[PDB]
Amino acid sequence: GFIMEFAENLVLRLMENPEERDRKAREHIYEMHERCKKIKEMWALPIR
Amino acid sequence: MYLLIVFLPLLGSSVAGFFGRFLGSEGSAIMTTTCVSFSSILSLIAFYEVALGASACYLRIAPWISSEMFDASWGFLFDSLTVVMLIVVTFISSLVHLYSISYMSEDPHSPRFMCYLSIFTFFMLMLVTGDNFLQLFLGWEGVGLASYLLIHFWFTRLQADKAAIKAMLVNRVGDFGLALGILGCFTLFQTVDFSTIFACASVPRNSWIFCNMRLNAISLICILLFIGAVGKSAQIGLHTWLPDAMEGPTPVSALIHAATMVTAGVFMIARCSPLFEYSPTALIVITFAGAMTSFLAATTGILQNDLKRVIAYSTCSQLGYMIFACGISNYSVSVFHLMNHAFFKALLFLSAGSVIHAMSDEQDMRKMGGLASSFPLTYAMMLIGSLSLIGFPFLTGFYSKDVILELAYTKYTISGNFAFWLGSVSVLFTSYYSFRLLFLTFLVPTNSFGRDISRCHDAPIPMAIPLILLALGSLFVGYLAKDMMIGLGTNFWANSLLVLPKNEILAESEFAAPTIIKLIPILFSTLGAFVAYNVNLVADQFQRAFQTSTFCNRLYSFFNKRWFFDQVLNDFLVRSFLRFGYEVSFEALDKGAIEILGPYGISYTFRRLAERISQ
Amino acid sequence: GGGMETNKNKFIEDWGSARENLEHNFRWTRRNFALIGIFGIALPIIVYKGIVKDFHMQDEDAGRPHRKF
Amino acid sequence: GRKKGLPEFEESAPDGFDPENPYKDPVAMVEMREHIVREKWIQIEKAKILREKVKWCYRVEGVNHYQKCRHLVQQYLDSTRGVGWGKDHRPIS
Amino acid sequence: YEALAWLSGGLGFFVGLGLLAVLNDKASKVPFTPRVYPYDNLRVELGGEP
Amino acid sequence: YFNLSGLILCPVLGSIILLFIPNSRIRLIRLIGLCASLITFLYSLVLWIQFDSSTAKFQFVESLRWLPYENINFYLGIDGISLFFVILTTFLIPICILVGWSGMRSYGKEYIIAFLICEFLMIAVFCMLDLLLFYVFFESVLIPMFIIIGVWGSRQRKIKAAYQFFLYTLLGSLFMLLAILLILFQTGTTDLQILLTTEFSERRQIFLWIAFFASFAVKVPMVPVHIWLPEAHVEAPTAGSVILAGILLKFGTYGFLRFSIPMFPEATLCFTPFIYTLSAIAIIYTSLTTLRQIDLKKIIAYSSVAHMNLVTIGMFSLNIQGIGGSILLMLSHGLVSSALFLCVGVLYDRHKTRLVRYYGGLVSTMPNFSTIFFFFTLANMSLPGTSSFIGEFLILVGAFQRNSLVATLAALGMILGAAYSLWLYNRVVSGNLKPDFLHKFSDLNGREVFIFIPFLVGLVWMGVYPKVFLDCMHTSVSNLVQHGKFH
Amino acid sequence: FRAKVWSMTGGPNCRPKHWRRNTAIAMFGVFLVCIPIAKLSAKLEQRPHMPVRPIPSQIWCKNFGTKDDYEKE
Amino acid sequence: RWATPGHEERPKGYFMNRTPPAPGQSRKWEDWELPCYITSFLTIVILGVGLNAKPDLSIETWAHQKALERLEMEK
Ligand SMILES: CCCCCCCCCCCCCCCCCC(=O)O[C@@H](COC(=O)CCCCCCCCCCCCCCC)COP(=O)(O)OCC[N+](C)(C)C
Ligand SMILES: CCCCCCCCCCCCCCCCCCCC(=O)O[C@H](COC(=O)CCCCCCCCCCCCCC)COP(=O)(O)OCCN
């Protein structure tokens, strides 16, 4: 073999799926922003 | 092949410096000089294949700063203008390398010297071959760095240390303008390369918003570039360094003080020719500054009584002349005088060093008398060099000084007439102190000591071959280059040097000559010869020593201390800066004033408030 | 002659560890007030005014109204 | 875990972003923000390629470059009006 | 401080001799006429429009 | 699957193993500490291989719950900027171990505990997207630096030096904490991705920007508050003092990039002249203060102050090239200042004077140290061909494109940089040799010679070819500059 | 005391016995590493101009007279 | 003086001031040297065949290909 065959493949298996990363970030943003309003309404409750 | 022109001196310097213990004081001397001579041969080949075989060579190695639309690359511009300076730098560098091996045979730290010289050669090759402002800026800063290192060759020497430090600061303050210039021209073109701004450099016509008030854009850029060239050409602004720069070794001074770093500031203008011609305002102030510096140096050199000090002022006068040549859009005489100067002042520097180190290392005019018949070789050499310096009719220096003065006379602008007057009156001064140098030494009764004359040893052969080569050059090069490059529209420059249709006064600088002004600087030269001979050989009973009451000793001090620039500038700028960096910033800003919040400012505050709270 | 450390001269020790603590000297004096009022409140104000003036002049050339800042 | 080729994210437009209420769909606002730079870099790169066009034009024509590159000089000068984030004349994107 | 007094005179000579070059007005003393080129002073080869 | 969790766990394992090692086994303590540090460095380097410099979103993220309702939680990750800081943090610490290698017998194992603790502590700062926990780890570095300055300080006056470095930091820290509380109570969470997408009030923007500036103007030395750095920095051990200017100085300046510029788009524009008028006069005043200095350590610290005040100008000048140049200058400064303090500390570990008056003519001896010192002075001298010049040229370009006045004052900084650093070089290692004080002295042995090798190679590499550094983060800088506005 | 300090660039009067042997190696060392500089440059030096007369650089170069047009860069 | 042999048996000074031992034995490498050296080699190899193995994906080459296929659409 040669260093390209032993390096390119390892790098491209270590990159780990850029599109799925963006998708996961998107639903994480949506889910945590939805939870944010729930937390705000939790704090809005009066003591009595 | 073209990469070998630049990288071989760097490789030789690196290997010599890294393995200066593996190679003796002569191994590095014969190795680095051989590499530099190979580079010189390569430069000659490139000159044959480019200057005559007119086809410029272009290349790009790798992107240096690959940011957004700020493409910086390691490419070089092997252009017709550039290759002439390739010849100029390589030939003189190789000759200086051959010169130094004889001089440095006694100086212990030999290999470090050729290491520094090759570093300088590599840096200035990178500068002249460069095609980007920032990539030219590395050469611009490296020339100053090598200048500092070479003047600082004597770490024990206290004067050399202070001279080197002051030279670095003044050169930094000088090229401040050029450094501002790179990004000044970038904010209008969004690029830094040369070929993409010389294509369209006349289109912008807007203004800017500077610190105080709105001014022009192109004119401001050219002004900044000229201020940058001031630091590396010892102009009126900052020329405190060159007169005090000859505190180091001699062979380098033939290369740094009068041959090549001389060419940096003028080559700044020469390379960016289609930028200054579209900024007429900058050209006029450039002409004023050049004429003022030339006259100032020419009248400066006459009083001084040292070999190296006076010729430094001659170099500064030639700097002023060349800056004016670059200030009237007549860049042809600028580069022609550059090529001549690199011959007939490097030759004089080698001759001065030869007569200095062969006479028990003494450089003086008051003490050393006459020993011309003791050795005719290097005196014949220096006589030829001086004859070129005055520009005796039908010599190498005449073909430059005559044409540059005629060009000064022809242009009727408010700066052309004033600067022509200043150059005409400076010809008398230069022909006076050149012959003063020729007379106070070698043509007077010997006033030296009786021990040094006995210990006399002529110039060794290896150091005399560079002198022979320079003498052969600066007697035929003027005649050979008069027609081929200043010949009313010679077709070898191509895009290297561009002259606008409007400000092109060359044909009427020769066919409209009144013949009462063209041959007048020879008249001032012969008058200076007469007065110098009379004062310094026969009529010296009262014309030499003036023991009057007042206004005559102070006249002596005014020009000896060079207009008190080293006094007024020091005390009023750097002494004040050093005073107020300790008694202002360290007193009423950080330490003492706002330190009322640190130790002893609030610590004692809580030694009373907290105490009276338990009770 | 086997000490790698410096001799620590007495006359140099005071010079060294005297400028390190200048709070006692720089407390209340006439020249201090002038220096502070001319180089810590004066110059910063002048340069700030220069910068905002430059921004205003840049805005005017483009034509957009100047921001309050 | 990628293909060996150059990535392609999206080119047409982000549908979620509405200019009238920029902060209404936080999920789609970041898409608009990244799309702005991914489309401005295209203009920056085409400015660079036309710069090299001009540079090689000046490097080939010779002394007649004041009459055989004006069609590209006008294509450069107008391309610097709204390129990147470099001068206070921001492009109207 | 006496050096500054000599400094003013030293630069005063330069600017003073610079003003004297304005008092003679060599611009109007040209023995020839401004240079003229064909094709609107070479308009096509200096810019403008083809 | 070399994720960020292991990069933080490895120093923790190194510290934990060192805790239960007897003091007698001095052979094993240094070996295992250095091995842990080098494994951490390699684990940081391998991240650069799999960085994927294409996406605008964040790289490998680790989420660990911190509150019962997942309101705010440990959320790791790098985008394009903190990656290089993580690499340089992981690289500086093994140099810290190596420089303090010979005298480890007196230091004991507690010396490596503090350094490894601070190691993973600063690792957890740069890759921390959650805003509040970024403050928890942002001020967590107080204890290790406090201990390093105090326990192993050079002179006895270290007691007063540490108090300033602590209290000045706490004041701004709590001022920032109040702003964090205001943001959390208003928005609801502190996650960075969400909090960047919240419409703020202009009146609220200015107050919160000021509150962040309360502390971030202390980490980067500003005009009102810069006294702590020299006093608390000359009086620290060389191995410890080399990261006060190495990573402890880049928190606030980098904190501006991540939590101020994209956070408050409409407030930085309104406060731009104030930052200009602070930094431009800082680069002048501090540089002038540098000239009239005698201690060898303080001059380098003042030069570092000037460099940080210069990079602050280029950071707040929002340009695609200004911010990139700011990051390049910060990395280059982290290299060069670290190298300079090692260079001036190797002199102290042999003679213990810290005075330029005693030093002189050190070229006639120890020439290798003289060559290294000259190279690093040139790097601090701001010469093209070194990584610094790439650093401040982009700063000047970004500043001039926005404001013409600020660029001239900033370049006055690199003009004045030739007044103190070159003077120090010629006054320390190029003067007249004096045998009265420096009776005897050696040269650099194999340890400090190898210490400067990575510094030299990285310096040259990032100076002559800074493409890879700019290549890896052009997307992130573009995303940061274009925020809030849509034109 | 000069013999004690290494002086990596060579001592003041450093004169090794076999300095000629080292110089021969050093000169040979420059030449052998100079070839990659020359060989790697052969893929460079783009000069679209054609000289009026033949130069001697046609043997190792071919980047002349080929880059004529500027519409496909 | 270009023909006489040099008057030096050995280059003056000691490399890193480490006195060479008696002839025949090795240098007796120190504890820190081996891990530091192997880590330097690992750093060199990772930055050599890792940096020149990462695919060139960025905002520069993607924009380059996109603008090369988008500037050609002038019609
Ligand atoms: C703009 C920055 C560019 C990069 C910086 C490197 C440029 C060169 C900078 C170093 C130049 C040499 C300065 C060394 C210090 C000078 C004073 C000194 O310490 O001298 C030492 C060091 O001597 C040297 O000069 C060594 C020079 C080594 C530098 C060679 C490398 C220069 C070329 C590299 C440039 C980079 C190439 C491009 C890389 C891609 C010993 O000299 P001696 O002759 O032995 O005298 C000492 C007295 N006594 C014998 C009694 C001890
Ligand atoms: C005294 C003995 C010292 C031994 C050191 C070597 C001896 C020579 C020393 C001279 C200085 C040389 C320094 C290297 C200069 C390299 C300049 C070009 C580098 C470059 O930009 O190209 C990169 C090459 O990758 C690479 O492979 C670069 C590998 C460089 C390894 C250097 C390791 C230093 C580690 C320091 C870490 C410091 C961290 C600070 C943050 C990739 O470029 P590309 O993206 O275009 O790829 C192309 C894909 N088409």
Curated annotation (Swiss-Prot), chain D:
Instruction: Please report the record's description of how this protein sits within the membrane.
Output: Peripheral membrane protein
Mitochondrion as a keyword?
yes
Name any Gene Ontology BP term. Answer: photorespiration
Spell out the protein name for this chain: NADH dehydrogenase [ubiquinone] 1 beta subcomplex subunit 10-B
Family to which this protein belongs:
Belongs to the complex I NDUFB10 subunit family.
Q: How does it assemble?
A: Complex I is composed of at least 49 different subunits.
- Give me the Gene Ontology terms describing cellular component: cytosol; mitochondrial inner membrane; mitochondrial membrane; mitochondrion; respiratory chain complex I
User: What the protein does?
Assistant: Accessory subunit of the mitochondrial membrane respiratory chain NADH dehydrogenase (Complex I), that is believed not to be involved in catalysis. Complex I functions in the transfer of electrons from NADH to the respiratory chain. The immediate electron acceptor for the enzyme is believed to be ubiquinone.
Organism equals Arabidopsis thaliana
Concerning PANTHER family, the annotation shows: NADH DEHYDROGENASE [UBIQUINONE] 1 BETA SUBCOMPLEX SUBUNIT 10, NADH-UBIQUINONE OXIDOREDUCTASE PDSW SUBUNIT
What subcellular locations does the record give? Mitochondrion inner membrane
Matching Pfam families: NDUFB10 (PF10249)
Annotated stretches, region: Disordered: 1-24
Kindly report the protein's main subcellular placement as a broad class: mitochondrion
Q: Which UniProt keywords apply?
A: Electron transport, Membrane, Mitochondrion, Mitochondrion inner membrane, Respiratory chain, Transport
Protein's UniProt keywords contain Ribosomal protein? no
From Swiss-Prot, chain E:
What GO cellular component entries does it have? mitochondrial inner membrane
Coarse class of the protein's main subcellular location: mitochondrion
Task: State the UniProt keywords alphabetically.
Answer: Electron transport, Membrane, Mitochondrion, Mitochondrion inner membrane, Respiratory chain, Transit peptide, Transmembrane, Transmembrane helix, Transport
| Superkingdom of origin | Eukaryota
Transmembrane segment boundaries: 3-23
| Compartments (UniProt record) | Mitochondrion inner membrane
Q: How does it assemble?
A: Complex I is composed of at least 49 different subunits.
Which family does the similarity line name?
Belongs to the complex I NDUFB8 subunit family.
The free-text function statement in the UniProt record for this protein reads: Accessory subunit of the mitochondrial membrane respiratory chain NADH dehydrogenase (Complex I), that is believed not to be involved in catalysis. Complex I functions in the transfer of electrons from NADH to the respiratory chain. The immediate electron acceptor for the enzyme is believed to be ubiquinone.
The identity of this protein, by name, is NADH dehydrogenase [ubiquinone] 1 beta subcomplex subunit 8, mitochondrial
